[PDB]
Amino acid sequence: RLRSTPQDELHDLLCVGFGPASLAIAIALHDALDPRLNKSASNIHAQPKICFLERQKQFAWHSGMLVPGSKMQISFIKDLATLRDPRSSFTFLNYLHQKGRLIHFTNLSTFLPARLEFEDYMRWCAQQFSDVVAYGEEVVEVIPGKSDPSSSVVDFFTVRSRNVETGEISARRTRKVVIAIGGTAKMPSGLPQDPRIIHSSKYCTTLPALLKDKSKPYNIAVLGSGQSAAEIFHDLQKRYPNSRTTLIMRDSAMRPSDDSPFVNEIFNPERVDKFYSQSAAERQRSLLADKATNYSVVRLELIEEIYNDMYLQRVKNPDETQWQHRILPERKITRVEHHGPQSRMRIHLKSSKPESNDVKETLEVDALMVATGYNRNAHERLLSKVQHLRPTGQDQWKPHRDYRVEMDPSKVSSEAGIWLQGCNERTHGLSDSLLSVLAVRGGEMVQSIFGEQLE
Amino acid sequence: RLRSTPQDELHDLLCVGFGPASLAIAIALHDALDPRLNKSASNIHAQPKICFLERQKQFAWHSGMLVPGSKMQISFIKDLATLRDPRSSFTFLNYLHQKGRLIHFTNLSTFLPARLEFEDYMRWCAQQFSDVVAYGEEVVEVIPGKSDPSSSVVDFFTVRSRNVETGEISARRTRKVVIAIGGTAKMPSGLPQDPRIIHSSKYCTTLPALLKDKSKPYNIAVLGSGQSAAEIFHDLQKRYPNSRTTLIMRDSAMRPSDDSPFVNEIFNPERVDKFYSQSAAERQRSLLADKATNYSVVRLELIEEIYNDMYLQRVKNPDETQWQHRILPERKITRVEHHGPQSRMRIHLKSSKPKETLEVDALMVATGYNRNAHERLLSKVQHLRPTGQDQWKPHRDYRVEMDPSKVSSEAGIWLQGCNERTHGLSDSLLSVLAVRGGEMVQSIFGEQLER
Amino acid sequence: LRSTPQDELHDLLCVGFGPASLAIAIALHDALDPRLNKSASNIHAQPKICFLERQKQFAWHSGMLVPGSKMQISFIKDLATLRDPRSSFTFLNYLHQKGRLIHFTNLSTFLPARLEFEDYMRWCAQQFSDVVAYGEEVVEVIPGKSDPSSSVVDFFTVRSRNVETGEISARRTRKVVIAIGGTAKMPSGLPQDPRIIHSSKYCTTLPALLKDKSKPYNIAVLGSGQSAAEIFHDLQKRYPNSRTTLIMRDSAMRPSDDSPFVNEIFNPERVDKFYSQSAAERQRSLLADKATNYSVVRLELIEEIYNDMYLQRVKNPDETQWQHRILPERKITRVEHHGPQSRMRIHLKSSKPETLEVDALMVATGYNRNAHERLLSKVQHLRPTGQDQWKPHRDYRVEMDPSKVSSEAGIWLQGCNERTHGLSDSLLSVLAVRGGEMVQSIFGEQLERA
Amino acid sequence: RLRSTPQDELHDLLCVGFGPASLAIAIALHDALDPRLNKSASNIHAQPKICFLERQKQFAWHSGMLVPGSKMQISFIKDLATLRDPRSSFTFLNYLHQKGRLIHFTNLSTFLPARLEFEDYMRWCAQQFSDVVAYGEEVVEVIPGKSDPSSSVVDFFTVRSRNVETGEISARRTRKVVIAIGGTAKMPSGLPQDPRIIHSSKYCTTLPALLKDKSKPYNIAVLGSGQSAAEIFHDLQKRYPNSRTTLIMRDSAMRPSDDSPFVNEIFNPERVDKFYSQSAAERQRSLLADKATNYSVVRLELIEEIYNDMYLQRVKNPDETQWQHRILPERKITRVEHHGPQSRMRIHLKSSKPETLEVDALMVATGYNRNAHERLLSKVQHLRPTGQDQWKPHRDYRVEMDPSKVSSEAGIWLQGCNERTHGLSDSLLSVLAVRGGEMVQSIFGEQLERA
């Protein structure tokens, strides 16, 4: 439970996006006000005026990548509450207990539930906050607010959102803003725009509408060699059984993701303090050394499955060029021909060896899945009408350790501010975009944003 | 947490033993009284008068088998509370959080903590009941009590215990008794008593006192082929590196324990209802069908290590009879000669099918456990049973049958941990303790807590 | 190995050309190779050998080449390695010849796909095409007396029916090997119907019955061993909108046991120890080791099937609503199948000492290994008087009355001797070593003279 | 069996070293001369005059690192013959069959034999070449020979070795030389030389002579975080149960070695052709991208074991600084005080980003160098093409020589030190079986074809 604020009142906090980062904040505030879990909150009566705006029509966790049988890449103990308080009612185990499913999950013997199940757990959590989440609202800008228009100090912010069904613009006033909008699809700048070129994030939701007949002999290419690329390549061979699929990667091979126990301690919540305090050179060097814990890597078991699928083809035909499904390593796409009335595009491939008697290959494909990752800079556009409130000379938003961005103290009241969530890897460590530290961080955020107010 | 009852007052419940079974009852009672876990408890004034008697000097979980590196045989999710309420403060995960170790345990990636750790967890739990647990008290009998002697109705029980340090006998009066005393060492009937013949349960605590010099080339035999035998045999080779150890088993081979997921559902808490209601013939048949889940089986990984160690010996010497450590299958012990001043006993071996001798400094007897010590403990109330029973018969709720004309309905005796035959293969393990503790709190204190 | 003209007196005739006989062909080849056996340089006389196989080409339980099915035994136990790793008929040399050895090395598995191990044995078998007559089903074995003045049987006539033409062919031999594997075991209570198909004919017969891979068929599977689990699992992929039901009289699928100490019962050198035990001892031993082979599923497939069921529970807590269901501790009491309805009605009762409407029932109830009894009925009078069963010696030669059968003639059994020779007899476990033993038993004296 | 050549004759081939690389060459020549394996070998009555010089007294494979329980890091299929011919009598599987051990190894279900076992397998191979291997001979230089008086062309080489027992210098003449001397111990340039500073390569042989009492509470430090460091650190805690061990590494963590299936194909024999023909810049980039397949990495299972042991210490005491065994990451050694009459050295630590210990010994597990052939060949380096400062092998491992200074019938080959031109597999067992066969063609092809 959290009771709603009338839309027109001045909010204490408005959060943009209701994915796992914002949801853990919602959960942490709930637990902070629960006197059974927090002996102090016995004397507390007033609840902060909180509001969440989410672009999707309901809570959903990367729905375009809910590939049948995909598993989480992280232990369920790192759910949205347990590392902060195992007694919380929002643990994965308590959710299973409520679904009457806990003993059955115990016999699974896995730390890595299906992505479908973990979505249901977080959907189960999120439903308990329906009175403070406005769905179908896409935030478009954040503009400065002044209670006295003749004042030179901004003391609140107006968040504007467009309803995804009507297009109507709504305005909500708040003292503090959290931006937790995840990542945007990153496409190679050389690729043209075309309904047959689909980022991995829209795989489950748009590809079936393009290629309607599940038995047709489509040619489908996949670009990339990380977890998204591997899952799409593996699934397409099951989803379209008569298809010819081609995995295109600029590396020489899929490489295994690293979560060996010592290396994995960089994701511990208490490391965030050490990481933040290092110099920019140390943080950059560290992120590069631990690259294989998260980016451009595939879970070993899935590498092993794809290799076995390829081995079976080799058993049937010693000639790799005749295989139904193929991996073309150390290639890059140099041209995509897509104009004209035909269904298929023509992809031109050259070696990915640095430009420093080469051969060019062509493919005709009905679709190209682009599994080339994500950017986390969409907040720059959302915050562009308040960036003049930054300190003189900053070209980028600067979060402190507590995730609040730096602002000119003469332009912004100390009672107003903006916080960033999920886009702070460079200052806060490889865990920032993941589920890794969300439970603990939600607690930190509730202290940071509401600590004085609750006390 | 739970406040004490004066020793001389009439108790609501007395529990004999403070192992995991009693600890689960204590925890569930705490949780039933916790307004965070039951809003239907914010309006509860009186805490029931509860008492626990434990013979050991502190909480301890088979400390004589705390073999270096030994692991749990069950997922940590089946702890003393989670399957009943994951919000409990007595979960394993919350314990880790209090110890500041939760994130580190996460990187272990295991469902099977070290036995040493799970002991500390339950010990951490047990400390919060220190005001209601009397340690160093060995219960010796349970005797019937009558508030009106002129009556034919037993309406309470007197539990007598001997202090392990002083020998003083104490008497406590209670309306209800729980017996949760675990198992006793099962010894083969043909073996004589000798300080060199030591049951597995006393391995860590007695053997080092006997074989003090860790460098001597002792001959040590081990009898059995279940989990206790496998762990002792493996550990002896590290503990006494120059020893010659011999594993003696009547089966042909160590066999893996079965916790494959469909088979493992017999341990689910909700199976207890189905199992309890089956006939005596069906109950026996299923326990025999599911034997490989618990008795006479070794965790697959431990077998593989032992086999690898033997394989390495074969690499060094192809003649098995010259090996330092040996496994002798399909053998039974027919005689042990032990009378004499000489240090070693002479073990005589025969085939286990329906001359070999070993001279040994010690024999570890890893032959399992019996669970009927309650029969001796309850013999002075045996006349209160319905006429014709030669055994104590627990109902589904674990309360034993008593002649309704001889025992008041407000008094009773419950059994815990010794009911495998009527309640399933999960009765003696950690499997259903969290849910079962909750059930017991309902059965014994439900009416009292509701009013 | 060079062929023998059909009409000549053979030294050895083998009935069946599956893995059991193939191991013999391979072992005889190696016994004659001077690279492997120095003495064979002084042998130019090859024994007169011939193989009769009922299938049109070599094939290894092809009605069960289920997509993704794996071997249940390490590739080291191929058809030659445990006898001689230098043999050209090893699995590793096959991979090397196919140019696949390093790629297989990167698979890091001891358990090849069944498809692959079948191709490995097919590669072996093709090198014996001159002594294998395919499409020939042996129908009887009949005694021969070469000396009209004696009553002593000193050879055998094996007659076979060609499966395509029906012509009956007769071949004379001094010694016979029967290595015809197993026959489908069906529960005695089940009626015959084209919709009731044993697991051995799953891949080959069911597709002809259920042609539309997308139709919402109800398909039941009976049993809980490796075949039941592989079919139950595959049907959910093969007919994705189907409703499948696994019917078992046990309470659960149970894991197969190949832990290292238990598994030593399959070692080649155990056969001597096993054979010499009493009948009661051998019977007790087979019962104690049942979980090594019968009524058991590889753990990984159990875990997989359980995971699929768990996903259904996530989607719907009501098991009775599931697309795919397991009904444990059940038995089939009646099958209603006479009628125009496309579906049969299966009647279920509890198996301790509800109905389904199904388009098909897969019967995964295992195999019998006694078909040799009918094949040998015209020589049964040659057994020692008082024996009601064929008795193999340790060397697999069946006992015969020395006053009725010349010592130069005899009959050997392969694959049907579990009760006398151990759990390894019907499997691949000891075939390479046993191939060697058979060549010594059958050709030892002849190869020495030669 | 290859027959020996008289010591004073002109050899066709002389090999420096008799480790696995040279042994694979010996095996491949044997197989090339076997008419059972190569049909042509029937019409060959001329065995090449071959000789091997090995400094150790008998075949031995990194005996200084035969840590109890250490395992191969490579599938046994990549033994010294199988990838070239599975029918060879020198396969690992055939060795097991000859030792009567094949079925027992099968029940192990592993591709990774114990290093102790794989050592014995290669020793079993090596015994069959005893007539052409001179043990106890340390090669010190290779000198050019001119058989034609007044000529300026080198057409043979003199290999000189010192007897390890007597110190006597022997001279052997050959037209072709193979250098296969493996790697030399790499020590950090800042550390001083002291009997207490011991490279990992001498762990099993030298540390026990230094720290003789296995029960004393030594402080033993280990430097590095690759496979050698991890095995020693792990072993020291078993070998010296009361010691205080400290792992010092400049990385932040031990990282797992990569042999996942697609990545691992860089080790396939046929990749050598692809790698060799790539540009110098492309080869350096590829070697950098695949580093985690071989250098500064630990087998995952071993990392997990070390992490488990540390977790247990955390269970016993939450204060990392009080643990018996400790890991100090992101440190480098800046100073060692060791000139003193006190038994312990003083190690000074600073951050390894761009504290003191007192220890009885420091194990330096800092890897290997492969450039000792430069010193062995220094008296023939004037024969390199003008302008080369380094030895350059062709694809077939023959080093380039000025065609006007060296007869085409003479030459020198390198084995194992050619990673920069031939791929990450060059120094390992990965391609030895195939490569030996290639070497037999390269060195003896014309000679065997004329025969």
Ligand SMILES: Cc1cc2c(cc1C)N(C[C@H](O)[C@H](O)[C@H](O)COP(=O)(O)OP(=O)(O)OC[C@H]1O[C@@H](n3cnc4c(N)ncnc43)[C@H](O)[C@@H]1O)c1[nH]c(=O)[nH]c(=O)c1N2
């Ligand atoms: C397919 C896939 C699978 C995983 C992962 C990534 C991907 C692509 N991740 C990493 C992933 O970032 C993480 O699991 C969470 O989604 C991060 O939560 P955030 O709320 O910061 O992002 P996220 O993208 O989840 O949530 C942001 C939300 O904001 C909304 N939004 C965006 N713009 C808006 C606007 N203008 N107005 C209103 N709402 C807006 C979006 O609709 C979305 O709901 C992961 N990590 C891990 O530790 N373990 C794992 O197993 C995985 N699995």
Ligand SMILES: Cc1cc2c(cc1C)N(C[C@H](O)[C@H](O)[C@H](O)COP(=O)(O)OP(=O)(O)OC[C@H]1O[C@@H](n3cnc4c(N)ncnc43)[C@H](O)[C@@H]1O)c1[nH]c(=O)[nH]c(=O)c1N2
């Ligand atoms: C070495 C070993 C290891 C395990 C297991 C057994 C053994 C021998 N078990 C099974 C084991 O029975 C179970 O884990 C618990 O110990 C069950 O606890 P109980 O409380 O029923 O008795 P348990 O034996 O624990 O404790 C009963 C207590 O009663 C006391 N007592 C006895 N008589 C008394 C008297 N007259 N007066 C006072 N006190 C008395 C004893 O001192 C003891 O503390 C197990 N199960 C599982 O599910 N997972 C696992 O990993 C294991 N591990």
Ligand SMILES: Cc1cc2c(cc1C)N(C[C@H](O)[C@H](O)[C@H](O)COP(=O)(O)OP(=O)(O)OC[C@H]1O[C@@H](n3cnc4c(N)ncnc43)[C@H](O)[C@@H]1O)c1[nH]c(=O)[nH]c(=O)c1N2
């Ligand atoms: C699906 C499946 C999978 C396996 C296994 C069984 C099944 C059903 N087995 C056990 C199996 O029995 C063993 O692998 C071999 O098939 C035994 O070979 P046999 O040659 O003795 O019989 P098998 O059935 O192979 O061969 C007998 C042959 O005789 C022929 N035949 C029969 N009657 C004839 C006649 N009258 N005239 C002419 N020819 C006739 C048949 O056509 C057949 O080819 C196994 N074991 C193991 O160790 N590892 C494993 O992975 C497996 N896998």
Ligand SMILES: Cc1cc2c(cc1C)N(C[C@H](O)[C@H](O)[C@H](O)COP(=O)(O)OP(=O)(O)OC[C@H]1O[C@@H](n3cnc4c(N)ncnc43)[C@H](O)[C@@H]1O)c1[nH]c(=O)[nH]c(=O)c1N2
């Ligand atoms: C502890 C350890 C363990 C392994 C490995 C390395 C180390 C340090 N390796 C890599 C290793 O390099 C490989 O196993 C082989 O030993 C390489 O064989 P070489 O014969 O080229 O050198 P190697 O060092 O084996 O042999 C060279 C020989 O030349 C001798 N020698 C040197 N100088 C001489 C001189 N001047 N005169 C005479 N003789 C001289 C030496 O005595 C030695 O015997 C490995 N790789 C892999 O693929 N799998 C694995 O499991 C392992 N395991």
Ligand SMILES: NCCC[C@H](N)C(=O)O
């Ligand atoms: N002996 C240990 C058995 C534990 C049981 N498999 C369970 O899951 O409860």
Ligand SMILES: NCCC[C@H](N)C(=O)O
């Ligand atoms: N059903 C297959 C059993 C094979 C047996 N484990 C063996 O190793 O021979």
Ligand SMILES: NCCC[C@H](N)C(=O)O
């Ligand atoms: N250091 C050992 C590397 C061996 C290599 N992965 C291979 O498979 O050949």
